[PDB]
Amino acid sequence: MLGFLSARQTGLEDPLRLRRAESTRRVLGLELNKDRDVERIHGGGINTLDIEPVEGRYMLSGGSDGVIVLYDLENSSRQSYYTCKAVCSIGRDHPDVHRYSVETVQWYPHDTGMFTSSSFDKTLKVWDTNTLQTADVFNFEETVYSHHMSPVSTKHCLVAVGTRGPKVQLCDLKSGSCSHILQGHRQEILAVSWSPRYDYILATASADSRVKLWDVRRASGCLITLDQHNGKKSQAVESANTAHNGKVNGLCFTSDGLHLLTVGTDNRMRLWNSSNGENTLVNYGKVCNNSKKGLKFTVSCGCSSEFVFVPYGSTIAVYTVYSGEQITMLKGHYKTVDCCVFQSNFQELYSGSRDCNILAWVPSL
Amino acid sequence: MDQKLSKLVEELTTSGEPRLNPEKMKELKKICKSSEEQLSRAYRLLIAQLTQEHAEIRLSAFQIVEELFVRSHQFRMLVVSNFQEFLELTLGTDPAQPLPPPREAAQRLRQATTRAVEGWNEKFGEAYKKLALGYHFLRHNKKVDFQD
Amino acid sequence: MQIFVKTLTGKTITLEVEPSDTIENVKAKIQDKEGIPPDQQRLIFAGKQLEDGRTLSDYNIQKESTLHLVLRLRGG
Amino acid sequence: MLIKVKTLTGKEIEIDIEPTDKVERIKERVEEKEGIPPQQQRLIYSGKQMNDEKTAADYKILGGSVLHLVLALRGG
Amino acid sequence: ALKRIHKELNDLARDPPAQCSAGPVGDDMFHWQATIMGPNDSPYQGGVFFLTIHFPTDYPFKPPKVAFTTRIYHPNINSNGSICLDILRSQWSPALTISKVLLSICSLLCDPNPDDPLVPEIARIYKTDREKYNRIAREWTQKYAM
C-alpha cells in the first residue's frame, strides 16, 4: 500500500484513488471482532438497526420485545478493547414503549434530534432523542412491517409505511395527515424505501412478488411495475410483471440511487434499473432467505466497487453489486440474521440477529 | 506415537462405561500433556467420535472434552474455534440433527453438557467472549433450562 | 440482665433474659410480649439465625445488645 | 455537624466535621477517636461507598447522619 | 406509596440497622441502593455486597425487587444477582420494612437451602462438600467484595 501513499504524495493519483482503494481493501478483509462488543439488552431478537446518517455516532436497534436501545459506537475508553455502551433505552417500563416487536427504527433525516419507530402494535411513534418522549404517534388499522423516510427530501417529510394491508400509507411528520395512500398492490407490503436520489420516488415491495416505484406526487398509480424478463413474456398488467416468484421482502437502492436491489423468498437477488425497471441480469447466484417480514440489508458507500451485505440465513453474505460475485460469507451468529447496517465512516458492519446479539464486524489489520 | 493414543481413546469411548476408568484416563492425561499437536490429535479423535451414532459414545467423548477443557487452555482456544459445531453435536440444538440413542445416555449428555457449559461460562467466559455468546444463545434463543 | 429486641412494628422492646436461657423461651417471651407464634419469628444477630435449640451464651450475646426480629422465610 | 460512624459491632463513634470537609478528613477524624488509619476504612453512607476525593457536602451529610465503617484489612 | 418510603428512609437514617445501609440513589425515591456487609463468622467476612432495590408503585402491599449487584456466590442467588426469597415473591408482608428485608437477606447469606435451589450447580457442591464451599465463597468474596 506504500505505492498508493507515494502516488498520492506526488499528486500522480487523485487522493480519491487511495481513499476508495483502501476502503475496498478494508471491506474485503471484514471479519468479526472480539476487540469490540455491543452490550446485550434485548430480551428477544434484534429486528432493525440504523446508524445515524450524520457523524455515524449513535445507533438504534428495534428489539423483537419492543425495547428500542440507543447505542454509542465511539470508543470513549482508553483501552484497545471496549464495548459500545447503551446510552438510552425505551424500556418496557417506559410509559409509551412499543407493546410488540419493533421492526424499523430510523433517524429523522437531516435531524438527529428525533427518530421514528413502528411495531406490530399498529403504531408509528416519532421519538425525541433527547427526552425520549413520543412527539407524534400514528395509529394504523393493521400491522406495520416496515417504514422508511426520505433520506434526501428537504421539502416534504412524508413517511411511507408498509402495512399488511394492500395499500401503502404515507404519514406526514409535519401537520398530521395519513390520508394520502398509494393503491395498486394486491397483498401485504413487506418493505418500502424512498429513492435516495429523487425526492418523490418510492419503491414498495410486496408479498405478491411485485416491486413498484411510485411517484408520490402522481396520484394515478405507479410509474413502473418491475418485470423479471424485461417484457420478453409480455402480458398486460393484471396478473403479470412479477419481480420474483415468491414474496419480495427487501429493497435497497444503491448508494448512487441508480439501481434498486431486491431480495425475495424465491432465493434470488436482482439488481433492477431504477429509472425504467429493467432487470440487469446480474446473477448473484442463489441467496438463501425464508423470513416472513421485512429483511433489512444495506450497500457499502465510498468504495471502489459497491458491495451489498444481505442477511443470508444465519450469516451475512457480501456480494459485489455490479458483478454478482460472492466476496465472502461473514459467519459468527447463532440464529437467523434480521438486519445488518454498514458504518460508512470506518467500513464497519453491525448485524443484529435473532439470538439477542449485535455482532460488530470490523476489518483486520 | 499416534497408534497408542487412538487405541487408548478407543477403549475409553467404546467401553460405554458410566464413569471414566481412572488409570487409563491418567495415561491419556500424561500423554496428552506430552505434546500439543498430539493434544489436538486427541481433539480430532473426540470430534470424529462425537459425530458417530451412539449417545453413550458421545457422552464419553464429551466428558473427555470437558476434562481437557478444565485441564488445558490451548484446548479451550481450539474448541471455542468451533463451539458452534460443538453445541450442535452436544446440545442437539438443531432439530435436523438430534442426539442418537439410547435415551438415558442422551439425557445424561444433555444434563452434563448444560452443567459443564455453566461451569465454563463461570470460569473462562471473560477470556473467551465466544463462549459467552454461545452461553447466551443457549440461555435465550434455545431457552435451555439450566435449572433442570 | 436484659436485652433489646427490635420488633417488626418499628417499636423496640427489652427482654429480661439470662445467658443460660434457651432461644425457645426467648421466642416465647417475644410471643407473650406481642404475640407472633414461636414458629414465625426468626431472630437475627449479626446476620445469623438464632437457632431454636440453643442459648444466648452460644452466640456471644452480652448486655445492651440488640436482636432483630423478622418474618420467617426460606430458600429458593 | 456531627456524623456518628457506627461500625459492625454497634459501637457508635462520634465525629465532628465542617460541611465542606473532604472525606479523607472524615477518615482521619475516625483515626483519632478509633485508631484505624485512613487506608483501612471503607466508609459506606446510605449504600454508597464514599470516594476519597468527594467533599462531604456531595453526599448531603447532615447532623447526626450515621455512616458505616467496614475494615479492609489489606488496605494497601 | 411515597409516604411509606419517606417514613422508612427517616426511621432508617435515625436508627440504622447494624450491618446494613440503604438510601436513594438520586432524585427518584423509588430506586434505592443498599449494602449488606458480610455477616461475621462466615465465608463472606469483611465483604460489602451492593444490592439494588426497586419499589413498586404500591410498595406497602407489593414486594420490592431487590437484586444483588456484586456477584455473590450462593445457591439461592443466581450469577445475575437475583434473589429468590419466599418472603419477597409469595409471602410478602407490608409489616416487613426495607430495614427488615435487608437484614433477612444478610441472615440468609449464611443459611442457604440447597433444596429447591436457584443454582443447582452450586447447590450440589454445598450439599455434598461444605469444605470446598467455604473456600469458593471466600475467593468470590475476596475478588468481588473487598
Cβ–Cβ gap E39/C74 under 8 Å: no
Write the DSSP symbol of residue A112: T
Cβ–Cβ gap E11/C70 under 8 Å: no
DSSP run (H or E) holding A59: strand A58-63
Task: Please report which residue ranges of A176-316 form alpha helices under DSSP H.
Answer: none
Contact predicate A30/A362, CB 8 Å: yes
How many other β-carbons are positioned within 10 Å of the β-carbon of residue A78?
6
- Amino acid identity, residue A342? F
Within an 8 Å CB–CB cutoff, is residue D10 touching chain C? yes
- Amino acid identity, residue C58? D
Pairing of strands A144-149, C66-68: unpaired
Q: What is the rounded distance in angstroms from the CA atom of residue B9 to the CA atom of residue B50?
A: 12
Contact predicate A47/A101, CB 8 Å: yes
Task: Residue B143: name the closest of A359, E74, A334 by CA.
Answer: A334
Among the partner-chain residues A34, A37, A356, the one whose CB lies closest to the CB of B140 is A356
Strand partners, A61: A49, A69
Q: What is the rounded distance in angstroms from the CA atom of residue A365 to the CA atom of residue A25?
A: 11
B chain contacts of residue E118, beta-carbon cutoff 8 Å: 147
The arrangement of strands across the sheet holding A88-90 comes to A46-51, A58-63, A68-72, A88-90
Q: What is the rounded distance in angstroms from the CA atom of residue A291 to the CA atom of residue A47?
A: 11
φ, ψ for residue B31, nearest 5 deg = -75, -20
D chain contacts of residue E37, beta-carbon cutoff 8 Å: 8, 44, 68, 70
Cβ–Cβ gap E121/B147 under 8 Å: no
Among the partner-chain residues E22, E40, E50, the one whose CB lies closest to the CB of D8 is E40
Helix B2-14 / helix B36-51 crossing angle, nearest 10 deg: 40
Contact predicate D39/D73, CB 8 Å: no
Torsion-angle region of A231 (φ positive above 0: left; ψ -120 to 50: alpha; else: beta): left
Q: What is the rounded distance in angstroms from the CA atom of residue A103 to the CA atom of residue A91?
A: 15
Q: What is the rounded distance in angstroms from the CA atom of residue A147 to the CA atom of residue A198?
A: 18
Residues 36-55 of C with CB under 8 A from E: 42, 44, 46-49
Helix B36-51 / helix B22-34 crossing angle, nearest 10 deg: 130
Q: Give chains near B: 3+ CB pairs under 8 A.
A: A, E
Torsion-angle region of E41 (φ positive above 0: left; ψ -120 to 50: alpha; else: beta): left
Transcribe B80-131 into DSSP letters.
Answer: HTTHHHHHHHHT--STTS---S-HHHHHHHHHHHHHHHHHHHHHHTTT-HHH
**Residue B15: which residues within 8 A CB-CB, separation 6 or more?**
B21, B60
C chain contacts of residue D8, beta-carbon cutoff 8 Å: 46
Q: What's the fold here for domain C1-76?
A: Ubiquitin-like (UB roll) (3.10.20)
Distances in whole angstroms, Cα of residue A354 to Cα of each of A13, A64, A205, A315? 45, 8, 23, 12
- State the burial class of residue A325 (Cβ atoms within 10 Å of its Cβ: 0-12, 13-18, 19+): middle
Torsion-angle region of A209 (φ positive above 0: left; ψ -120 to 50: alpha; else: beta): left
Cβ–Cβ gap C42/E104 under 8 Å: yes
3-state secondary structure of A213: strand
Contact predicate A58/A70, CB 8 Å: yes
Helix, strand and coil content of chain A, in percent to the nearest 5, comes to 5, 40, 55
How many other β-carbons are positioned within 10 Å of the β-carbon of residue A200?
17
**Residue B32: which residues within 8 A CB-CB, separation 6 or more?**
B5, B38, B39, B42, B68, B72
Contact predicate E109/E74, CB 8 Å: yes
Q: What is the rounded distance in angstroms from the CA atom of residue B70 to the CA atom of residue A357?
A: 27
Distances in whole angstroms, Cα of residue C53 to Cα of each of A3, A126, C24? 86, 65, 7
Cβ–Cβ gap C65/D10 under 8 Å: yes
Q: What is the rounded distance in angstroms from the CA atom of residue E74 to the CA atom of residue E118?
A: 9
Chain centre to alpha carbon of residue A342: 9
Find the angle CA(A113)-CA(A116)-CA(A118) to the nearest 5 degrees: 165
Q: Which domain holds residue D64?
A: 1-74
CATH number, domain at D17? 3.10.20.90
How many other β-carbons are positioned within 10 Å of the β-carbon of residue A178?
16
3-state secondary structure of D70: strand
**Which residue is closest to A45 within chain B, CA to CA?**
B141
Task: Residue E18: name the closest of D50, C65, D63 by CA.
Answer: C65
Query: C-alpha cell of B7?
Result: 487405541
Strand partners, A148: A160
Query: C-alpha cell of C68?
Result: 432483630
DSSP run (H or E) holding B5: helix B2-14
Contact predicate A301/A342, CB 8 Å: yes
Cβ–Cβ gap E121/B115 under 8 Å: yes
Tally of domains in chain D? 1
Q: What is the rounded distance in angstroms from the CA atom of residue B99 to the CA atom of residue B110?
A: 9
Contact predicate A335/A352, CB 8 Å: no
Task: Residue E67: name the closest of E58, E77, E59, E57 by CA.
Answer: E77
- State the burial class of residue C74 (Cβ atoms within 10 Å of its Cβ: 0-12, 13-18, 19+): middle
Q: What is the rounded distance in angstroms from the CA atom of residue A171 to the CA atom of residue A138?
A: 8
φ, ψ for residue C26, nearest 5 deg = -65, -45
For an interface test with A, give the residue of B94, B137, B138 to mutate (most A CBs within 10 A). B137
How many other β-carbons are positioned within 10 Å of the β-carbon of residue B22?
8
Among the partner-chain residues E13, E32, E146, the one whose CB lies closest to the CB of D65 is E13
Radius of gyration, CA atoms only, chain B: 15
**Residue C43: which residues within 8 A CB-CB, separation 6 or more?**
C5, C23, C26, C27, C30, C49, C50, C67, C68, C69
Residues of E annotated as catalytic (active site), given as ranges: 84
Q: Torsion over CA of A126, A127, A133 and A139, rounded to 10 degrees?
A: 30
Task: Residue E49: name the closest of E91, E87, E106, E111 by CA.
Answer: E106
Euclidean distance between the first and the last CA atom of chain B, given in angstroms as a whole number: 42
Q: What is the rounded distance in angstroms from the CA atom of residue B48 to the CA atom of residue B60?
A: 12
How many other β-carbons are positioned within 10 Å of the β-carbon of residue A218?
11
Pairing of strands A114-119, A102-107: antiparallel
Q: What is the rounded distance in angstroms from the CA atom of residue A4 to the CA atom of residue A202?
A: 40
**Residue A255: which residues within 8 A CB-CB, separation 6 or more?**
A196, A299, A300, A301, A306
Transcribe chain C into DSSP letters.
Answer: -EEEEE-TTS--EEEE--TT-BHHHHHHHHHHHH---TTTB--BSSS-B--TTSBGGGGT--TT-EEE--B-----
Q: What is the rounded distance in angstroms from the CA atom of residue B140 to the CA atom of residue B124?
A: 20
Task: Residue A355: name the closest of A71, A46, A38, A32 by CA.
Answer: A46
Q: What is the rounded distance in angstroms from the CA atom of residue E34 to the CA atom of residue E45?
A: 18
Q: Which domains does chain E have, with CATH numbers?
A: 1-146 (3.10.110.10)
Most distant CA atoms of chain B, gap in Å: 44
Report chain E residues touching chain C, CB-CB < 8 A.
11, 17-19, 36, 38-42, 75-76, 83-87, 89, 91, 93, 95-97, 100, 103-104, 106-118
3-state secondary structure of A231: coil
Half-sphere exposure of C35 (CA within 13 A, CB side): 0
Method for this entry: cryo-EM
